Symmetry: D2
């Protein structure tokens, strides 16, 4: 009395974004992270205008921009031949390690006074406003946020209709030193998406995060016993990416690299009663448009906006989904099409349609940076 209370399950980008945005609006917010430490996995990440605008709204933009990188261009190669160079007509974008982004959100959530619990796993949620932890402890609140990832127990304990999919193939994602000097002549501040189908299917997404750190995604079929191996098989990667040898040598030193498969989900509904699902829990998607976390953050931020309208929580949640979900649905669908067709291999695929989610400004609720 009379403070609205929110329990947030999940300490990833969506959960942290929701917790900050609610807390800024005067909610009493508690956040539960299942693992032993607040931490992001996946090495590196791209954000665009939409996600950057969310960060502005969270008061964490400038902490993220300091120590992250915008390449001079987004370049695509096919068999070492440059097939496209894209700068998106000025649309802002940024590459950073996941921990850089995650640290900035943690720092902000903590500074705002978000109640943070780790080793705290949500195992059940009730639409009347109850969150049950693995300890058996039952929490009552006016709002429950399921931001607990693609394997969401908040979602599955309630039983939402879904269409869930797991990929055949996967990739290895790593942070290594830039080795820029050792790379010699070239445009080594660029994003370079290096595709190959001959002599083998192997791809590297080359992604500078700053002056010190390079984010690499190494993509090879699961049925390729060498290309999919971790720690990496140096020989098969150097063979097809010899110009990256200095960085690949450093990558081969990382004993805890993982080969991860892609996973998606689409839900009929994102809400039930006082429970809202946000992020991968609601809309895990293919990463072709690099909008999974971007949409997760736009959605979590937009949830806080609809909760300011004076409505009941239940009504605000229905209004939220109705307003914001089509942007995500369209983005998820197009990114799935790109993934299935290997569209990015052709270059020049960041079309106006592809950049729709990136152009969205969640703060002013309009589309900006026209294409």
């Amino acid at each position: 009395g009379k403070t609205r209370r929110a329990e947030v399950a999940g300490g990833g980008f969506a959960g942290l974004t929701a917790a900050i945005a609610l807390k800024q609006n005067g909610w009493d917010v508690r956040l539960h992270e299942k693992s032993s430490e607040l931490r992001a996995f996946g090495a590196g990440i791209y954000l665009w205008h939409n996600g950057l605008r969310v960060l502005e709204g969270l008061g964490a933009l400038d902490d993220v921009l300091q120590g992250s990188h915008t390449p001079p261009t987004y370049e695509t190669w096919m068999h070492n031949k440059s097939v496209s160079k894209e700068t998106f007509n000025g649309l802002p974008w940024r590459i950073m390690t996941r921990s850089h982004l995650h640290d900035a959100l943690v720092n902000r959530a903590r500074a705002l006074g978000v109640d943070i619990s780790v080793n705290s796993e949500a195992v059940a949620a009730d639409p009347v406003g109850r969150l049950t932890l693995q300890t058996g402890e039952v929490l009552e609140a006016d709002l429950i946020v399921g931001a607990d990832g693609v394997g969401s127990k908040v979602r599955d304990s309630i039983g939402f209709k879904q269409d869930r999919w797991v990929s055949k193939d996967g990739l290895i994602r790593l942070i290594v030193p830039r080795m820029k000097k050792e790379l010699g002549h070239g445009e080594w501040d660029n994003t370079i998406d290096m595709w190959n189908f001959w002599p083998r299917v192997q791809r590297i997404l080359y992604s500078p995060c700053n002056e010190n750190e390079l984010y690499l995604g190494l993509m090879a079929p699961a049925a390729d016993p060498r290309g999919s191996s971790v720690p990496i098989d140096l020989e098969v990667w150097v063979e097809m990416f010899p110009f990256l040898e200095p960085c690949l040598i450093e990558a081969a030193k990382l004993k805890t690299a993982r080969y991860d498969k892609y996973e998606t989900t689409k839900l009929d509904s994102w809400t039930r009663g006082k429970v809202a699902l946000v992020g991968d829990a609601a809309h895990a998607m293919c990463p072709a448009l690099a909008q999974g976390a971007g949409c997760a953050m736009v959605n979590a931020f937009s949830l806080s906006q609809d909760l300011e309208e004076g409505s009941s929580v239940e009504d605000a949640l229905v209004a939220w989904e109705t307003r914001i979900r089509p942007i995500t649905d369209r983005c998820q669908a197009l990114s799935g099409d790109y993934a299935a067709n290997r569209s990015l291999s052709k270059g020049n695929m960041f079309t106006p349609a592809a950049l729709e989610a990136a152009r969205y400004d969640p703060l002013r609720r309009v589309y900006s940076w026209p294409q």
Copy 2:
């Protein structure tokens, strides 16, 4: 009544910005333009993050972004050799025709209900809150804004201490078709600053505004009777910029081109009683950093911010100048140094110091996009 009243002298970028920002804050605003038509001269213009943020604050950003251009890179040439390519670490920037920008500000000021008078010339202002027109008509107001350009009569009728300066050399600025196809192979969406000292001092700043329009600045010494001639001496320009021949041919058709010299002013004070000087009236500068209008817009917008603090107008004006002027002073000084030393000819000159003004966010009052 209790409705604060502002009289704004000058219908340029500074005047229009001040009128919009004040009107949005509930001022009763009247704007006076000396000439017979609201219109901008000078062909094309660059804005950066700081000015784009002002546009966001004026509710005119997206009208400007639609139909303007961000080059993939800002390139510098010396004797046809590329000596630098700069993308400013993601810092937003934009090139556009002056009429594109000016139309967007006029549409917005008009839409908001600003009282617009043309053929209305301010010839005297009084710090107690009086503006006199050339008609002899005397207007009383709570705030007087001198946005009447480098030859400000609002300023000179009051007698501000100044250090005024006029260049010996100048340039011809024009809008022509892109002729992109005709330019053949190259990077013709780039900004390209093409310097030459041999065989003659001639420079062209090549600045695409959109798919249809190209902004060209043709710089030659005033003592050069061919290079400084208007309409342009096609031969002496084609001779040193042969790759631009299709565009230069179009430029030669422009009968109303002008050769304009540069002009600067620096004032000990920007305010006196209820009178505030904004834009070129207060701080006309060398255009090396392309920040003259950017600073003018930031200062005009920031004026409206300080007027929301519940102070007397007089105190608010003093607080405004104290808060905002050092950014402009430093920018003016550095741009003057660059101009005197021809620093831009070396390339790579958009350093962190050069970009200080561009990095400023007038909305949040912090510096963004670190360099």
Copy 3:
């Protein structure tokens, strides 16, 4: 006066006829087809072949109207993987008819007797050549220069290892369309390799300001790539930067898909019979030395016949002196073909260039690598 009968009016036969005639031989040459003509569109010659032409007095007629690219470039999947200029070693590209005309005109100026529609059907080491008219000709020397299907060779019975590939290529002369090709380095040789999305290759070879020589290589089991007249779409699809030239190529109704063919013989001579060119040593074309070696060998035969020996002895000395250069070139070129080595670029090594470096006039290797 010594008499020679030469079977075959290709590069090897014409070279032999001219070289012998210059040395005072009385020479008649027999061409099986009804007109003197060279097939195969375009051809590369190197230092060795150019030196032969100098020795034949036909160099300048060949250099006028032929082309040396600024560089020999190799692409893999449109990526430039090498540019080679061979440390100044001279080389030249030309239409086959240009080279063939220069040789025919020289032979005619010298008084070589040429009979078209005259086929050698049998030969005898004692010095007899039988024509398809049944006429038996007697001579001090018989030159079997009658190509890979040599009847001079097969009527005598030379032990050989003869081979034909299942795959082949289409060779055409088209206009340069240089302006329509827009920006690039369109005076270069460009060997444009691809294995993905399909196995298709174009050897791009400018012959002069007007004529471009193209070799379009696709497997026989590819019904589109191997089709004649060309399936325009499948070629434009993988070589879109060549569309103006391919459009012209598509108009060529008489285009052929020719298979590769090689032979290696234990012996090149039998009594007064000498086999030269494809009759003796047809090879894979990777090193572009088939005619080069043929011409060096035919020219060298005339040299050994000036030593005062019996023809029989001179022929043995000729083979002993000159064949290892050809054997090594043939073996390396076959290795390159089998391993698709040219696809890697930078493959014109000192070893690859051995034949090209040979100067048949001074009998030394020049242009070191």
Copy 4:
């Protein structure tokens, strides 16, 4: 009946004449004024014409081994590449001068040419007499004045000439390639690097082989820094920073010289039994890189005309008539290029510029058409 020739001068022209004469059964003695056989000027370009002479001298393969043909002849103006030329296959070659000189000396020695160092011709007589600085008077059927632009064979006789020296010059050096240190680029190319701004400074960059680089540093004599020897490292690195590793080695060369350009044109190349060849007769501006080329073609051609059964006197007249217009035209065009700085524009090796290079002295025809 053994014909006898005395050749004054042991540079490219003298050695070429001596070899060619000797090959044709002349008894040949050659006199070199300096105390040792040696070529100065660091490096040198030869073209088809000069390479053909070497073939005719039986010295081609010794020259080709250890010399270099660039992939392309490139020109820069203010660091911008303005042309790349390969001359439609026309053979050319860059080498150190000592490499060329050594091949010629070794060949003359193998043929039995009698060479006297520290032997200066101080006077000549058209009747066939050569006077040495020992006062010895030599008699011969042919006297070859191959004694350079300051020819005493020429001046003792008195040939009408127009001789000229420039105020400006250049520094020519051989340095290591430092190819790895040069990093990314096309460092096997010839690169003629022109600048007029901020200062008039030019470097002709000329690789001779895997180990040696030939540099020509051209600055006006009135520039006390650019014309300084040993080189003012700073002013060269300033305008050619991409060549710093090579220039650092260049700065170590204490015996560097600033040499001035010299030309001469004579109304006549012959007098009685005396023939003037090379710089003695036709020193020219170096734009077309044909000074030694022409000298060698002319020296080789002289031996050809002496094989016709004429008197030496008649053969010399026929020689000059046959061969001089190629040299006259080359010299005139080269001087025009030098005066107009034409090479700075690129693409200047036109058919006309390449006329001398295209000439084949062995078959007496023009080859490699342009």
